[PDB]
Paper text:
Phospholipases D (PLDs, EC 3.1.4.4) belong to the [name] superfamily and they are ubiquitously distributed in various organisms including mammals, plants and microorganisms. In the aspect of protein structure, members in the PLD superfamily contain one or two highly conserved HxKxxxxDxxxxxxGG/S (HKD) motifs, which were assumed to act as active centers. The catalytic mechanism of PLD enzymes was well characterized to proceed through a phosphohistidine intermediate that was formed after nucleophilic attack of the phospho-substrate by the first His residue of the HKD motif (H116 in SpPLD).
In the present study, the crystal structure of a PLD from the plant-associated bacteria [name] strain [name] was solved at 1.79 Angstrom (Å) resolution. Crystal structure of the ligand-free SpPLD was obtained at 1.79 Å resolution by the single-wavelength anomalous diffraction (SAD) method. The overall structure of SpPLD displayed a β-α-β-α-β- sandwich fold. The structure was composed of two tightly interacting HKD domains with slightly different topology. The two HKD domains self-dimerized in close proximity to form a single active site with the catalytic histidine (H116, H311) and lysine residues (K118, K313). Two highly conserved motifs (HxKxxxxD) comprising the the putative catalytic residues His116 and His311 were found in SpPLD. The two catalytic histidine residues of the HKD motifs in SpPLD were both located at the interface of the two core β-sheets at the distance of 6.7 Å. While superimpostion and comparision the structure of SpPLD with other PLDs within the same family, an extended loop between β9 and α9 was found distinct with other PLDs.
Numbering used by the authors: -4 to 383
The structure:
């Protein structure tokens, strides 16, 4: 059993990268780079990628990923790569040129703010309309090596079809925006039946194809249904949006649901990155730590031995388990901007098997030397994710 090197439930495989040089390895989960390479190798017709940005360093694991993507293009696979305009400033320009040089690849840059005010933040892949990948992993060499990252390879046809429809929607929207043509909003047509089983949730509502569950509705519904324990891991948690003139207006949707669950006696566990201990966010995090039944830990991943790496050595997985029975694996941090006005994707799996494996992964981090309880009395130094 022990030497089985992957974890699946029907329709879903759990895919995981631990930072190198940490006690966070999971030999039973396939890692991001190996899964992406195999997904590209299996492509016979189409590969679609929706990404926030593209960042590379010569000699990284992303080089192999890009090699397999290029080989797919050379094989005659049509590749459509959609990236957020705000991601350009985060991207490696040479890597963007390499992508454009792949045969049969079209690269489109979408300013998703012209649609809903936020960004294309989702990180996902589609192969032949048959398989998808959704996860925290950016198209970034650091996501493959230096960051705690979690995603799902999806073969559930219904869900893949919805992700494909979202990609098609945003691809065509990019072309309409380029021509200064209107992008019509999509009618909100929710199914009256309560969601069951395994399903996609997505944002923003206004550009969700028919029948795609609005994540901003579903996350509070899921939290309202919790009876015993909610465990959450994000990079960032804040009841705040990023507004004009650097303002940070209050954002209540998620925080109300967590506080409501806590008030019903549900135990809340929350893990965030040390990057989240910046001001003002740390004050609100301390505020949440005083709520009954809430425990918060801050996770610090140590630097890699060869030296400081900007915007790396951090936890990035966006995970939730409810009652050890329901699992959430998403692209969104839990602040304003993600579920309301940005393109994000989250998977909800009412799967005891997946929830148990995710709870083991969560406990591994929670119980590690990298996680420590929030300290109410401590003046957290400004994180310097970029350095110094």
């Amino acid at each position: 059993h022990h030497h089985h090197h992957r974890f699946d439930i029907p329709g879903y495989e759990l895919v995981y990268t631990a930072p190198v040089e940490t006690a966070l390895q999971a030999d039973d989960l396939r890692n991001t780079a190996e899964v992406w390479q195999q997904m590209f190798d299996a492509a016979k017709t189409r590969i679609d990628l929706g990404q926030f940005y593209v960042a590379n360093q010569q000699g990284s694991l992303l080089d192999g990923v890009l090699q397999h993507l290029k080989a797919a293009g050379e094989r005659g696979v049509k590749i459509r790569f959609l990236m957020e305009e705000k991601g350009i400033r985060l991207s490696t320009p040479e890597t963007l040129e390499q992508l454009k040089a792949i045969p049969n690849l079209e690269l489109r840059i979408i300013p998703y703010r012209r649609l809903s005010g936020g960004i294309l933040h989702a990180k996902y892949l589609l192969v032949d309309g048959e398989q998808a990948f959704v996860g925290s992993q950016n198209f970034d060499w650091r996501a493959l090596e230096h960051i705690h990252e979690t995603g799902l390879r999806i073969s559930d046809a219904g869900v893949v079809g919805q992700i494909q429809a979202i990609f098609e929607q945003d691809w065509r929207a990019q072309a309409l925006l380029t021509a200064d043509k209107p992008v019509p909003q999509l009618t909100y047509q929710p199914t009256a039946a309560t969601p069951q089983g395994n399903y996609l949730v997505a944002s923003p509502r206004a550009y969700n194809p028919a029948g795609v569950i609005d994540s901003q509705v579903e996350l509070p519904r899921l939290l309202a249904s919790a009876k015993q324990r909610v465990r959450v891991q994000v990079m960032d948690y804040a009841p705040l949006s990023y507004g004009p003139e650097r303002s940070r207006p209050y954002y209540a949707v998620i925080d109300n649901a967590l506080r409501s669950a806590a008030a019903r006696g549900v135990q809340i566990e929350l893990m965030v990155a040390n990057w989240n201990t910046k001001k003002p966010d740390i004050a609100w995090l301390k505020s949440l730590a005083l709520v009954p039944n809430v425990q918060i830990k801050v996770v610090t991943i140590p630097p890699a031995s060869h030296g400081f790496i900007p915007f790396a050595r951090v936890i990035h997985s966006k995970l939730m388990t409810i009652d050890g029975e329901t699992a959430w694996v998403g692209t969104s941090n839990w602040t304003g901007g993600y579920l309301d006005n940005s393109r994000n994707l989250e998977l909800v799996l009412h799967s005891p098997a997946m929830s148990q494996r995710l709870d083991t992964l969560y406990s591994q981090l929670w119980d590690s030397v990298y996680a420590e309880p929030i300290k109410l009395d401590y003046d957290y130094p400004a994180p310097k994710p970029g350095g110094e």
